[PDB]
Symmetry: C3
Subunit: 102 residues, 3 copies
């Protein structure tokens, strides 16, 4: 298993492409996105959630910091991080797989 940080961004749908570009520019290998609903701060609003598995904590925080500094003054959103282990993932773990041995 390969340790990963799972970065989660829940935010407004209109930032989809801008956030995807930031994800791509961080070096992350991919991302999953979904339509969600939410309340913050009749009442529910449509929003999107991104999930980005990253090899390092620093890549996850780069994406988070770049998103927040650029957009979170003006747009609703939260960003949080969970620990995960990747078991299978051609691009994430490379050709040796997620449980290569030395």
């Amino acid at each position: 298993a390969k340790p990963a940080n799972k970065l989660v961004i829940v935010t407004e749908k209109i930032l989809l492409k801008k956030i995807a570009k930031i994800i791509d520019e961080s070096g992350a290998k991919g991302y999953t996105v979904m339509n969600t609903g939410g309340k913050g701060s009749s009442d529910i609003e449509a929003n999107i959630k991104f999930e980005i598995l990253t090899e390092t904590r620093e890549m996850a925080e780069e994406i988070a910091d770049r998103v927040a500094v650029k957009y979170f003054n003006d747009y609703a959103g939260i960003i949080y991080i969970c620990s995960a282990e990747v078991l299978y993932g051609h691009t994430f773990c490379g050709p040796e797989g997620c449980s290569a041995w030395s």
Copy 2:
């Protein structure tokens, strides 16, 4: 980053507003919700998943207890909890922000 408990409730779609009402009454600061499918062990059923990040474990368990007692003896549903750290979140972290140096 601010430690959080991510409470997850997966249940029947007809309980959307009822469970939202409990979350709103609890003092949790927000929630995310999504349409899902699922099977339990009592084809795929239409259901909903809530995610509620809470500042304390006691709040998460209070929500969970209240939902479970009020509905889960009469309706299908599971509740679980994951550890998360919040990096950005106006409401969750408050005006202090998420103490980036912690």
Copy 3:
């Protein structure tokens, strides 16, 4: 609370039933599935499963069977998170999760 492994499988939508069948055959008591989008190697419509298992070996058995059977030919990732189940009739049994 009862410790659980949350196995997450994100893959191509066409594998929905095939993966469901493997989950069911593993002993897992249930699963959740949702429609998502993803970019790996624009966004493509795909599906995400979440399966809570009582043991880590059951989670890895599902993962291994899925990957061997499908991941040479189909796009996908599989990862695992730690969770604790608070309420879950089948998952925790008649005594509850504690």
